[PDB]
Symmetry: C2
Subunit: 164 residues, 2 copies
């Protein structure tokens, strides 16, 4: 009296799902690395200060969240996910779309020839002490939503290993 | 007479190692998203063309690979890793150190007030049909090295679940 095939499939499934979620979490976290580059140039010894001219960096962030967005779109579709987890996915996807919509709507500010440090922070820096009025707020919401989904996905992996 | 607990620990350890590896592969792949942004502004409908002024975007990529490099430096140190995997990690960390070294070395090209698209491509765009002479070559190497590490890491997870 025991049971292995079903338990094995359950760990495989839960791990496969966590993989997709983890990949999305990494991408979102990575905007924090891009924010460190606001107003920075590559110099002889690493990043040094060279304020402003940030547009293409924000474009980078936008490109990354685009990929997040596309990945979640595809996750939303996976078969055999619990209603629960599908909901947590939708919350992330909504947050991601939100960020992209906000950024687009601030084209005049974020796409101009010289986006100043302050404004770049309002788009992509979650520790921004300024207004978070050009993406940052939406980025915080995304971070909260993906942290929730990842917590759930990893919980399932743990449960599937210990139900062993 | 199989030892549920040793099998369980091995799944857990292999999965935690893959988690770290996977997070590094995603950070490296993300450079491909950033490259899509070279010479693009955020516009009312998404990225649109706005040539050049790419320095801060390259800084972004630089920042991201710093994070990769740091993560691998920590991985290198994990206890209980097989010599084989350790070697596979070293190949990745070497490649990321290489990238940062090359970028730094091309400061006069990459940190100037107007880095043109072509140049940006030679740093951070692995499908660049131009020279790969300011980072791209090293980024391609990094890509190969982490793909190999990831393949190994994921193989171990599947072995660990299958050994079950
Ligand atoms: Ni300057
Ligand atoms: Ni997070
Ligand atoms: Ni322009
Ligand atoms: Ni790859």
């Amino acid at each position: 009296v025991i049971d292995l095939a079903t338990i094995t499939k359950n760990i495989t499934d839960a791990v496969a799902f966590a993989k997709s979620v983890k990949d999305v979490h990494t991408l979102v976290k990575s905007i924090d690395e891009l924010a460190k580059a606001i107003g920075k140039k590559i110099g002889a010894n690493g990043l040094e200060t060279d304020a402003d001219k940030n547009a293409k960096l924000i474009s980078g962030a936008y490109s990354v969240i685009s990929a997040v967005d596309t990945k979640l779109a595809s996750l939303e579709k996976k078969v055999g996910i619990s209603d629960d987890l599908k909901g947590k996915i939708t919350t992330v996807k909504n947050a991601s779309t939100s960020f992209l919509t906000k950024a687009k709507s601030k084209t005049a500010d974020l796409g101009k020839d010289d986006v100043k440090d302050a404004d770049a922070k309002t788009a992509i820096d979650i520790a921004d002490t300024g207004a978070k009025d050009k993406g940052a707020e939406e980025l915080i919401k995304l971070n909260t939503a993906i942290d929730a989904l990842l917590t759930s996905a990893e919980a399932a992996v743990t449960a599937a290993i210990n139900a062993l």
